[PDB]
Design a protein around this ligand. Structure first.
Ligand SMILES: [Cl-]
Ligand SMILES: [Cl-]
Ligand SMILES: [Cl-]
Lengths: 158, 156, 159, 158
């Protein structure tokens, strides 16, 4: 029926979407154009985003999720995946997945063309995200965001 | 050990993939590469699928609890969604909020249809198959398939 | 402050509550006065009920939950607890708990005074409940209640 | 299975060994705890028969964000403090706490032992406030993080 045409986004509908200019709240160098495919069609439990990262910019602030899984599939362009210590070049057709607690990561575009990726994530009401380079932990609980310096956390049990 | 979370394009080309046939539709045959299982994802499925000409992606279905989406990488297909057909092609995306639309995809083209299928993985779901008139209740490993004519709907 | 006083239900408030006359839809003998202490204060994820079962009546239709836990604490009087193929007498201060899939049960009051219990249970958006004596399975899924004769269920897989 | 294991007679309960419990933030919150739920295998609710002696408390004044809790008084008398008001409690009284409704604690200022059933949700994640200590506890699957409220940057609320 005509009332489910909206669930299909053709390639050219996607191309013409403006998307949002997004800067990560802890990294002014993490700047991207974000086209939320999931929000366009009404998905509420996962995020599916077509992102464009220009040369010299990053995908995020180096981070590790405790409850939300996340993944990235490269569509065009080339980048550098930083994962724990290590750096890995990435290219189109590459996939990276992050099970909970597995590995902190960020992606940079140190190339000469736009890096275009699908970013795929769970959307949960509660999560904990660490930002090791900032020494901060975010507790996110049903819309309440609580950012705490890791030095201020008394760990009673691990 | 962190290298295991990255699958290069070349590694993905070398993956054998699994031959999969949908339990309710013998024409729903694909070769599936579970990218999420290869890196250890447990709450989402992310699969790279190949559907040959004349075959389908699934049995026409509707989820009550798991969200699902499809992103076309190469080739061409026909999406059947709430009894309407739409041609699909590389770069097209279709997503399914729960209870929104029953669908299936067929490859009536000449070249392989390659897609990424992205879904939630939940311990409990209910899935309708309108052309079979069956509802599947899937509950932690127990699968119960019931003809819709045998379901008595109750009020709260 | 004053807006919190409603979270306390004193003994006299409780004894004065009329409660609801509740009859299980699968068992006309399962008739009880139900005082929902949890709904009175605003609990949403648990059910806490003070129930009265008169002599000759029962607590429920014999059933098994697959996802919601349930428990009973006897405050006064006596009853007969049926679990699977076994019957046990119960009396004041006794406690019975039902982990998921553990045992089908019902309680009868075959004594001479009212049987008064606290019934404590989870409230989940999804559950499956079996009524073995009626040959029925109930699938409850956020507001969609689906009752199916057990012979009409094709079991394709089990864990 | 052996169904007799799901039934605890009043006598069995009488006989059960109590666990001596002291709240981690309040040395005056001492009780003897009998976990009825654990004794029979319940995993998603806590049902405890507790004994609080004269001069002791049930807890450190607190508020749950995700787990519901309730108390039903079996014998003895106590004083319920809830949102800074005091109420006498006695046998047959019930008090319940929807999430975020009210901070409370119970004190036994009587002369007899205070005996109650404490009924609670058991969740993997919870947030708990202790207003008298100006601390927040983030409990996430076995990791316990205690943070002074002064050290929390609230970036967003609901
Ligand atoms: Cl297009
Ligand atoms: Cl830490
Ligand atoms: Cl019938």
């Amino acid at each position: 029926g005509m009332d489910t045409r909206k669930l299909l986004l053709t390639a050219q509908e996607i191309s013409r979407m403006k998307g949002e200019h997004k800067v990560h709240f802890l990294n002014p160098g993490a700047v991207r154009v974000n086209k939320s495919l999931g929000d366009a069609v009404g998905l509420r439990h996962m995020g599916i985003h077509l992102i464009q990262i220009e040369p010299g910019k990053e995908s995020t602030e180096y981070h590790l999720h405790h409850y939300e899984e996340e993944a990235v599939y490269v569509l065009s362009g080339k980048g550098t995946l930083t994962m724990e210590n290590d750096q890995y070049p990435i290219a189109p057709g590459d996939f990276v997945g992050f099970p909970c607690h597995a590995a902190a990561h960020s992606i940079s575009n140190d190339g000469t063309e736009t890096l275009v990726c699908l970013v795929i994530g769970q959307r949960l009401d509660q999560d904990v995200v660490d930002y090791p380079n900032q020494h901060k932990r975010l507790y996110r609980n049903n819309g309440e965001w609580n950012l705490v310096d890791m030095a201020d956390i008394r760990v009673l049990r691990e």
